[PDB]
Design a protein around this ligand. Structure first.
Ligand SMILES: *[C@@H]1O[C@H](CO[C@H]2O[C@@H](C)[C@@H](O)[C@@H](O)[C@@H]2O)[C@@H](O)[C@H](O[C@@H]2O[C@H](CO)[C@@H](O)[C@H](O)[C@H]2NC(C)=O)[C@H]1NC(C)=O
Ligand SMILES: *[C@@H]1O[C@H](CO[C@H]2O[C@@H](C)[C@@H](O)[C@@H](O)[C@@H]2O)[C@@H](O)[C@H](O)[C@H]1NC(C)=O
Ligand SMILES: [Cu+2]
Ligand SMILES: [Cu+2]
Length: 691
């Protein structure tokens, strides 16, 4: 396993030949070993990698999609970089290239002849087709969209299209015989290069390529002046005006490997080196990013400048981006099924118990709300990226991270006013006031104070929640200035921590002693109530929760047996000034103000999410038209499932529609600062995917 020699998969004769020369300058620099396997096509390459007969292959976005699917489940490990040394970029522009003289806009291509890089390819098929869907009058399954494309343009070249079913798609392929319109070099008109040629040769009226092809293939620059682009706003502009004129901005090709025992480091090292020795202009012996006058893009893209390593949290789905990923699956959808999905809100539920309540809510939503699930919040943030889930209510800590992931706050949870209104009929426009983070202890614990909580046992909501962690740990951090957060207290129950750390030391898992230290309600000590249960059961010595938590859980405010007999007066708060106060004085005895939990989504889901959540609260809200004979959206009672049980309503954001503006300057400064002690894999994945 983990390495030795990495078997690359060639898809061509001249790829094997380059793969073989590579094999050789490598051990001849006494570098890491690359051995080569052969096949006729990208999927044979995908099958091989999956049946362990090869380890890697650089695929186009289109095949990364394909490759991620079962029973493959292959992962991008390295992305190619484009542009130049410092203007390096892991993405390109799908453009629509035409010759000057004609005037016909991208809305005027019906009956035109077209040249495609190849079926299933990003700029060549996926985008241009996904872009003109409107005009195609397509019926939807089971009629392949190919049939609709074949009926749109007069004749086309699309390497890989079915000759037989789809005659016209191959029509202008220039290959000879069984080679006519094939997904290989045997076809003069394949890939970015063949497709531009098709255009050049008069064969096609439009070429659906990458933005660099005309610069890579037309030397004299007055030669280049014979083309222009078709902009999406039904315009025409210079081939160099591509940042202002492109169909899409897609992810660069990536090297994919198995995601089980994939030899990811074996692969990274070999790439890391080769790129050193033989990368852009260095060591003539060989050239990793160049192709013998005959061929083009052998094994990798002509003129790539290196590789960029794909952080492990990333999969096909996250690799592709929701926009794109979703776009490939919509090509196998009716414009009905596609509009159904759009109007529908997919909720992400953390753990089983929230799913139950989700199902339940779903059942009563008149199909507006459907449910999704994951075991952690982070996993739930990822399905929203994948466009596979659409929203969840989150604690401010996570709003930061989703935020970095590009999601935006949509509505915030509203709680019992500064004692402003009554069952405030105006709780949709009442600006939020955030909640109070506080440290609680047993009254009994006289001697315990702010100043001497350190090195004792702590109870936390979970790692990365405002009250529960950011605040307590950020304040202490600001003193000692240490990153060894597992040395602040002797033992804790901080769910979502290393089950092996001291920080999980006091977690109890589920009713069966399993699920211990998990960051969901199946851990008995998880969340607000859990953190408090931790204290009241003398597991921990302080509990980091909010004030309302003690109220809500004592004096038959909570009927769980754990909580029954607990009386408010038995607990106290710890002030930053070394004093101690009673739970009623939290307004003057709290660590800080936490921002209200907020519901986050993709920008594309916003207005509709708003509409649905608003409609739906009207019916199962606090004083809810169906609440509570039918369903109380805001109750799980003592569990804060999907929403905090104390939500008066979901209110409007008063213009703070950025994680930054919502969370505020100081708050974000602070998380960042804590984030450097260490970043989550998700934050790592989102940085990578952000540049
Ligand atoms: C796409 O549809 C438009 C209009 O949509 C409908 O056209 C109706 C007339 C019915 O047949 C519907 O069932 C149909 O889908 C079509 O206009 C368009 O192709 C037509 O363009 C043709 C070329 O000029 C022309 O022969 C027709 O006059 C024209 N529509 C009009 C005004 O009827 C379809 N484009 C396709 C299928 O690619
Ligand atoms: C947060 O840090 C601020 C900087 O002063 C602290 O810096 C340490 C290095 C140490 O010498 C301490 O004297 C200071 O507390 C500080 O002025 C703020 O009071 C700090 N506390 C909070 C939680 O705000
Ligand atoms: Cu490509
Ligand atoms: Cu919170």
């Amino acid at each position: 396993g983990r390495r030795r020699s990495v078997q690359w998969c060639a898809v061509s004769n001249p790829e094997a030949t380059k793969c073989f020369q590579w094999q050789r300058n490598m051990r001849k620099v006494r570098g890491p070993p690359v051995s080569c396997i052969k096949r006729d096509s990208p999927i044979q390459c995908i099958q091989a990698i999956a049946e362990n007969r090869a380890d890697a292959v650089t695929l186009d976005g289109g095949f990364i999609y394909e490759a991620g699917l079962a029973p493959y489940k292959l992962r991008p490990v390295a992305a190619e970089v484009y542009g130049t040394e410092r203007q390096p970029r892991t993405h390109y522009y799908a453009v629509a290239v035409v010759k000057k003289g004609g005037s016909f806009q991208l809305n005027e291509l019906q009956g035109l002849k077209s040249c495609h890089t190849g079926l299933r390819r990003t700029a060549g098929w996926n985008v241009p087709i996904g872009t003109l869907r409107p005009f195609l009058n397509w019926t939807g399954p089971p009629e392949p969209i190919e049939a609709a494309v074949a009926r749109f343009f007069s004749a086309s070249c699309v390497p890989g299209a079915d000759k037989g079913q789809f005659p016209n798609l191959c029509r202008l392929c220039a290959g000879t015989g069984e080679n006519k319109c094939a997904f290989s070099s045997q076809e003069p008109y394949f890939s970015y290069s063949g497709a531009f040629k098709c255009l050049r040769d008069g064969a096609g009226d439009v070429a659906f390529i990458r933005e660099s092809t005309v610069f890579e293939d037309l030397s004299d620059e007055a030669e280049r002046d014979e083309y222009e682009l078709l902009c999406p706003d039904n315009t025409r502009k210079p081939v160099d005006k591509f940042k202002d004129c492109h169909l899409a901005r897609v992810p660069s090709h990536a090297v994919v490997a198995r995601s089980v025992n994939g030899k990811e480091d074996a692969i990274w090292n070999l790439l890391r080196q080769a790129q050193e020795k033989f990368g852009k202009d260095k060591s003539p012996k060989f050239q990793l990013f160049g192709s013998p006058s005959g061929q083009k893009d052998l094994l990798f893209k002509d003129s790539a400048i290196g590789f960029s390593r794909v952080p492990p949290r990333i999969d096909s789905g996250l690799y592709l981006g929701s926009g794109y990923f979703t776009a490939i699956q919509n090509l196998r959808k009716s414009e009905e099924e596609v509009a159904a999905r759009r109007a529908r809100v997919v909720w992400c539920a953390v753990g089983e118990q929230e799913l139950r309540k989700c199902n339940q809510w779903s059942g009563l939503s008149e199909g507006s709300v459907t449910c999704s699930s994951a075991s952690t919040t982070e996993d739930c943030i990822a399905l929203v990226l994948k466009g596979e889930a659409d929203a969840m209510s989150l604690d401010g800590g996570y709003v930061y991270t989703a935020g970095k992931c590009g999601l935006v706050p949509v509505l915030a949870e509203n709680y019992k006013s500064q004692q402003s209104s009554d069952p405030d009929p105006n709780c949709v426009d009442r600006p939020v006031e955030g909640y109070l983070a506080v440290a609680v202890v047993r009254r009994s614990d006289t001697s315990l104070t702010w100043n001497s909580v350190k090195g004792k046992k702590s109870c936390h909501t979970a790692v990365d929640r405002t009250a529960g962690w950011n605040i307590p740990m950020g304040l202490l951090f600001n003193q000692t200035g240490s990153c060894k957060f597992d040395e602040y207290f002797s033992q804790s129950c901080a769910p979502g921590s290393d089950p092996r750390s001291n920080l999980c030391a006091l977690c109890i898992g589920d009713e069966e002693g399993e699920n211990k230290c998990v960051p969901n309600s199946n851990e008995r000590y998880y969340g607000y109530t859990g953190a408090f249960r931790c204290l009241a059961e003398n597991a921990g010595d302080v509990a980091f929760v909010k004030d309302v938590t003690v109220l809500q859980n004592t004096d038959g405010n909570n009927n769980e047996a754990w909580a029954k007999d607990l009386k408010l007066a038995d607990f106290a708060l710890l002030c930053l000034d070394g004093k101690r106060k009673p739970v009623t004085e939290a307004r003057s005895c709290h660590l800080a103000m936490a921002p209200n939990h907020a519901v986050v989504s993709r920008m594309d889901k916003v207005e509709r999410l708003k509409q649905v959540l608003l409609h739906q609260q009207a019916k199962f809200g606090r004083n809810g038209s169906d609440c509570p004979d039918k369903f109380c959206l805001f109750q799980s009672e003592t569990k804060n499932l999907l929403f905090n049980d104390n939500t008066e309503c979901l209110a409007r954001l008063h213009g703070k529609t950025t994680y930054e503006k919502y969370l505020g300057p100081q708050y974000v400064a602070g998380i960042t600062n804590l984030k450097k002690c260490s970043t989550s894999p998700l934050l790592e994945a989102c940085e990578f995917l952000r540049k």
